[PDB]
């Protein structure tokens, strides 16, 4: 019965035409609750999840996100030269947040990447840093010697994140609890004398799902390919599995789909 809050921060030297150079996406469990970007310069809730938000709270989120924008711009102007890299474009990333476990205990997370590679991590429980390489080590030693970062982020992860997680869970409880059954389609195309049975589960929420193929009532994983779980724009998800089958055996296979919206797992055929 645990819950999670995560922030995904990206700064970019070359985001693409018309693209913000700095973006924040925030998630509560597997649901986007709000975003920030350097073009609008405003942090805004996803009103479908959070329909009655007070401006005070998002004034606060905006300010804090704008500070993150300045720091990422600061880093992107200094780190490429410190790494002696000739790369054209550069990226800076950070993911941080907290978990509240079922028994009420707390976990904090705080990790950075530069050009898509581990850079620095902070462990709130020990209040210690980990550098990914000797260049990041210089930052680690500076941060820990000044002492201020550990205190700020122990408070941020262990107190502020937890408070906001509880707020978002309450404010967005209708959205978070509303289950959406998948619509399952099973298809078959016959190429080169073999039949590909594909199973597609459309538009489910929440995110966890399993899809298995069976023959004569016995699961068959060795010949199965899974497409993975991918997003729809409305907060639901999509997932798929395929298996290759002799066309003469096409009626003997069953797709098994298990989802929290289904009291019992669903069995589907071609």
């Amino acid at each position: 019965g645990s819950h999670s809050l995560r922030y995904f921060l990206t700064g970019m030297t070359d985001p693409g035409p018309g693209m913000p150079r700095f973006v924040i996406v925030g998630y509560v469990d597997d649901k986007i609750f709000g975003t920030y970007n350097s073009k609008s310069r405003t942090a805004q809730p996803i009103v479908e999840m959070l329909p009655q938000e007070d401006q005070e709270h998002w004034d606060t989120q905006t300010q804090k996100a704008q500070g993150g924008e300045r720091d990422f711009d600061w880093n992107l102007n200094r780190l490429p030269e410190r790494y002696n890299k000739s790369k054209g474009s550069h990226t800076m990333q950070m993911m941080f947040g907290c978990d509240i476990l079922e028994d009420g205990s707390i976990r904090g997370y705080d990790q950075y990447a530069f050009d898509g590679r581990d850079f620095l991590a902070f462990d709130m429980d020990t209040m210690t840093f980990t550098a990914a390489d000797p260049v990041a080590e210089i930052t680690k030693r500076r941060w820990e010697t000044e002492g201020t970062y550990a205190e700020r982020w122990k408070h941020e992860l262990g107190t502020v994140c937890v408070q906001n997680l509880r707020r978002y869970l309450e404010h967005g409880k209708a959205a978070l609890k509303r289950r959406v059954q998948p619509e399952v389609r099973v298809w078959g195309k016959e190429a080169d004398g073999i039949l590909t049975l594909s199973c597609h589960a459309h538009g489910f929420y929440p995110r966890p799902i399993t899809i298995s193929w069976m023959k004569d009532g016995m699961v068959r994983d060795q010949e199965t390919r899974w497409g993975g779980i991918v997003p729809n724009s409305d907060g639901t998800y999509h997932a798929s599995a395929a298996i290759d089958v002799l066309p003469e055996d096409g009626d003997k296979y069953w797709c098994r789909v298990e989802h929290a919206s289904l009291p019992q797992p669903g069995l589907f055929s071609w």
């Binding site: 720091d71 600061w74 880093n75 950075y112 850079f119 930052t139 941060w143």
Partner: peptide, 5 residues
């Protein structure tokens, strides 16, 4: 966080 040096 600024990655000072």
């Amino acid at each position: 966080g600024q990655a000072v040096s």
